[PDB]
Amino acid sequence: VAAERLEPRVEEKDGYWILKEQFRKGINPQEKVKIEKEPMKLFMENGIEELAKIPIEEIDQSKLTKDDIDVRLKWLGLFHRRKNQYGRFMMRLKLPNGVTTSAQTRYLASVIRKYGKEGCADITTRQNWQIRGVVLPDVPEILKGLAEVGLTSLQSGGDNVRNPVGNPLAGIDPEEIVDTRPYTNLLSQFITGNSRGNPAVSNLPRKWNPCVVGSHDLYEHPHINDLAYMPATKDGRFGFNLLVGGFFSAKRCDEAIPLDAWVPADDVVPVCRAILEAFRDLGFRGNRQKCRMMWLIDELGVEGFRAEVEKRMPQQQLERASPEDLVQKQWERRDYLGVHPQKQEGYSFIGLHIPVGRVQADDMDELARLADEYGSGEIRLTVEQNIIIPNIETSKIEALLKEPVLSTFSPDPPILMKGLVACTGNQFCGQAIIETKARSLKITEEVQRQVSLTKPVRMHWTGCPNTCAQVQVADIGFMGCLTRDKNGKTVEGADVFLGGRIGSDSHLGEVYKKAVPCDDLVPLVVDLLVNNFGAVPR
Numbered sequence: 001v002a003a004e005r006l007e008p009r010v011e012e013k014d015g016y017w018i019l020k021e022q023f024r025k026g027i028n029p030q031e032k033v034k035i036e037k038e039p040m041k042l043f044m045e046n047g048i049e050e051l052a053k054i055p056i057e058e059i060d061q062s063k064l065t066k067d068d069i070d071v072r073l074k075w076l077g078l079f080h081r082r083k084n085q086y087g088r089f090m091m092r093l094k095l096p097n098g099v100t101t102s103a104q105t106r107y108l109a110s111v112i113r114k115y116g117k118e119g120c121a122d123i124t125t126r127q128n129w130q131i132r133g134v135v136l137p138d139v140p141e142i143l144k145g146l147a148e149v150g151l152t153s154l155q156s157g158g159d160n161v162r163n164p165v166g167n168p169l170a171g172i173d174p175e176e177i178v179d180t181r182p183y184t185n186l187l188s189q190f191i192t193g194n195s196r197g198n199p200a201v202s203n204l205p206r207k208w209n210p211c212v213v214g215s216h217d218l219y220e221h222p223h224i225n226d227l228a229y230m231p232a233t234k235d236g237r238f239g240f241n242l243l244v245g246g247f248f249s250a251k252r253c254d255e256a257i258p259l260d261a262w263v264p265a266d267d268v269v270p271v272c273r274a275i276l277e278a279f280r281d282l283g284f285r286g287n288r289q290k291c292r293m294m295w296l297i298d299e300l301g302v303e304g305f306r307a308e309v310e311k312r313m314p315q316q317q318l319e320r321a322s323p324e325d326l327v328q329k330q331w332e333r334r335d336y337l338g339v340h341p342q343k344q345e346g347y348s349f350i351g352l353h354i355p356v357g358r359v360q361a362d363d364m365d366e367l368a369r370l371a372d373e374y375g376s377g378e379i380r381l382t383v384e385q386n387i388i389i390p391n392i393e394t395s396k397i398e399a400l401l402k403e404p405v406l407s408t409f410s411p412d413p414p415i416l417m418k419g420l421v422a423c424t425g426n427q428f429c430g431q432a433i434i435e436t437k438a439r440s441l442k443i444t445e446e447v448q449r450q451v452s453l454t455k456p457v458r459m460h461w462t463g464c465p466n467t468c469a470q471v472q473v474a475d476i477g478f479m480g481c482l483t484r485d486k487n488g489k490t491v492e493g494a495d496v497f498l499g500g501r502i503g504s505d506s507h508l509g510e511v512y513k514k515a516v517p518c519d520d521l522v523p524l525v526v527d528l529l530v531n532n533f534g535a536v537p538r
């Protein structure tokens, strides 16, 4: 690699970071959008106030404003549902480590409640909240309300650092390695500039996913993150080994690889900055399918990329990885659903199943109520789109288990429901080929009626090749497709994946059978479970 390749391609101008004139050739359309107007201006210069006053029909009549609602607003966590819910916006937070409060949960519920049939909320595969039904004129008030309850939605979509994932048992687990909350909190604060916006990291070539590992279980899926912090002692000191470049896309899925770097715990933010700076400065900005950080690592080589991180560290030093980390390879991933003792004597947490991660405003109020009456007012989200309520006096558990809402959000659902994960799909998502949430519940219900099993088989449903529901990590994955019935009529289908493993012995699954009509999946899955996962016909 020539020295010329290492020239930073972006420059700070008027407090924002923009592509240098000479590097603007051959860029993708989104890169053109960002040059035409810096997206962070909608928040940091309050551009949203005036935009929110223009009727959507009028917004659509000029490129600048259409690009504002369809692209730039993702920097404020707003996603126009142009195809499937025209004029309405999904809104996505920053929620480091999946931690929410009952007050925050009630606030979100009050927003979606306003929108009636157009409103609901979802737990995401990054242990985050999304709300739906938002109309543009309401955006200024919603931003204020979020701030008032201690939430931000900044930089949650587009070419930004995504939700920092951590251990859902952080601080409460007798078996945790390190409490991940301080680190995910620090990362989120750094990314969002303490909820004011951070333009130094808002103009990346592409999305970028971070996680901090605190569990032997590897609940955080470090193998599929752009940056994963693996806890490890080096020369008598606590810190993290760094894995880099994990990603999924329609074209390519790759597991994270060692950067061959260790940082002390206090250097978590400096190294995140260094890596993001190198990605920002040097990343390819052409074909959108070749813009994720792994593509840069492949171009420069891991050592080449490492040197770029090193030069961006304070005192320009980056230690080599520690030969071992703290994560025990001898480990069985623990079920967190149900009642479990915390490390604090006399206290328990409860894991509750949220069917396909979908909640309505009344459900959200009920969960917030439970957290206040039984816990400490805290609700935790998980990447399987479930919830944990921590900090419950164990003497309160008998009463809790009699709560009517627990028949809907159960501490002990059937085993296949425990592992079921499904993306938004075509109810709201414009990229979706099929409906996912309702369909996956129906199919899973029918399958479990036919077989019993003891192995915690994990089934993931995703609506298109973007694979937001991570079908490549599943025991059985289902990727939406259109296919044909025996009469040659168009029907919704799934490509079925097998081979995905999580935890320390991770592996990416692959397509096993293409183009199966959704109406034919029950018998296929029943047989797969009996033949491959020890299930027994009822």
Ligand code: SRM
Binding pocket: 079, 090, 092, 122, 123, 124, 125, 126, 127, 128, 129, 130, 156, 157, 162, 163, 207, 209, 224, 246, 247, 248, 249, 250, 289, 292, 422, 423, 424, 428, 429, 430, 431, 466, 467, 468, 469, 470
């Ligand atoms: C909500 C969520 C799925 C879910 O039901 O939980 C989701 C939903 C969407 N994803 Fe995703 N992604 C979600 C996790 C993921 C993950 C999984 C992960 O992070 O571990 C991936 C695969 C891992 C990865 O990114 O490396 C994922 C890969 C994508 C991609 C393909 C990325 C690529 O490099 O090609 C897109 C399309 C894109 O960005 O170009 C996409 C784009 C989208 C959009 C914003 C598409 C669009 O605007 O309609 C979806 C919004 C639909 C909606 O209304 O909800 N989403 N998306 C997740 C929100 C996470 C969060 O809170 O931030």
Ligand code: SF4
Binding pocket: 423, 424, 425, 426, 429, 430, 431, 432, 433, 462, 463, 464, 465, 466, 467, 468, 469
């Ligand atoms: S996998 Fe496809 S259908 Fe599902 S939320 Fe992501 S982009 Fe939409």
Ligand SMILES: [Cl-]
Binding pocket: 074, 157, 158
């Ligand atoms: Cl996005």
Ligand SMILES: [Cl-]
Binding pocket: 080, 081, 082, 083, 084, 429, 430, 431
């Ligand atoms: Cl759309």
Ligand SMILES: [K+]
Binding pocket: 353, 354, 355, 356, 357, 384, 385, 386, 420, 421
């Ligand atoms: K769930």
